Structure to design on (552 residues):
């Protein structure tokens, strides 16, 4: 029954690291995707000006930049990691 | 043997929520990344016109926007969540 | 004790597929997000030229494109998948 | 029924933004047409004064021609459309 | 061998797109050169008629000068390149 | 303390880039002002030679007016800012 328990707890560690790396990637993805979204939006404005400094005014009906929010997800994963913590000893 | 079984089933719930949040993030990521890709592509076309309304024609050899498709992934995760469902009772 | 062990190993397979699909999505996300980042940056340069071929010079203080790197994450997940492999038999 | 309410909500959000976009487009056309028409009227005014050099000197204290700007408005509606995007509900949640 | 076949496939996809891009670039140069040359010929025609005002009146029923458009084509090839991108195989799958 | 060191590091990275951006902006203004001023001086030179057509012929062997380029520099600093971005530390790691 030690091999099971040991294999078990050994698997939980592995799992938590998996979700840990995932949450990290998620965090790294929101950052880049958003950083680029801002670069894009800020580019739209710098264009609306120079196409006027010269109708050459942009069509924003199809120039809508979206931002990503993964806080809800990353928190839920953190709960899972924490919950998994609830499965170990007791002899 | 209840603590094990209980710890086990307790861990599965946690796992499924982890993969659930992941699949959600994946869904949220395809949406934003694609939405922005379209905003970018639609911006290219609105530029090819105004650089002609004035060779100022863009170079699309390096202006290729790519779309992301995570359906294969999200489905596989849904299978995993479902499969995990196959490990619980039996006394 | 077979049902437990069987349910266990049955759950590990499911888990590894979950992390496998995740790592795949991560790989698919870095690719698209980066591909689009390059399309965006290359668009900035093609613009700095045509706004000069006509101060209409862009403001790069807010035109900074970022690239995403998930190698650290994807490797850690691969370790988890491998580690999980360490929990199976022994009668 | 959350899905229903949420699907219903996200559904109307789309419509609203489309509505606010259509208003912005509208406002852009108005600024273009009204200003072009003001500018032509202003040019008529300059030509008439010279033409009348044949006093028949027009009174400019009452021929004020205005113009532009709704871009403040344009941008304000543009933000609302963005903040509206931050309101879509994740049915998965 | 899936990896092999897939790697081989993705590999040729790259080459094709590069091929279709090179064709688009080519077609763009042709529209630029042929039109510029048509336009210069057309201007020669207008100058000659005036010059000959010294009948030596040119017959324009047979001096038709055409021009432009391959952008339809340009865009068509541009799509193929995109739909080609939707075909790369995920070796991880 | 890794977090501390890392937070401290990422923190200074921001400042550096801001610094390198401010330098690029600066260099852009200088190219704009110095060239505009060279170009005006050069135009003064062409006008003076004609004006003096009243020998009072200026010696151009010693009136060399230079100009432009810092874009090489501009781009070089622009890269450093990007490579700097590839250095931020993931505190989660």
């Amino acid at each position: 029954q030690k091999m099971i328990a040991s294999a078990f707890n050994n698997a939980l560690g592995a799992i938590q690291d998996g979700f840990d790396a995932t949450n990290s990637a998620l965090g790294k993805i929101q950052s880049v995707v958003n950083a680029n979204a801002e670069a894009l939006n800020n580019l739209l404005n710098q264009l609306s000006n120079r196409f006027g400094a010269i109708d050459l005014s942009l069509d924003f009906e199809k120039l809508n930049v979206t931002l990503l929010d993964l806080t809800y997800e990353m928190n839920r994963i953190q709960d899972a990691i924490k919950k998994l913590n609830e499965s170990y000893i007791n002899l």
Residues 1-91 of chain B form a domain with the Single alpha-helices involved in coiled-coils or other helix-helix interfaces fold (CATH 1.20.5.300). Chains B and F do not touch (no CB pair under 8 Å).
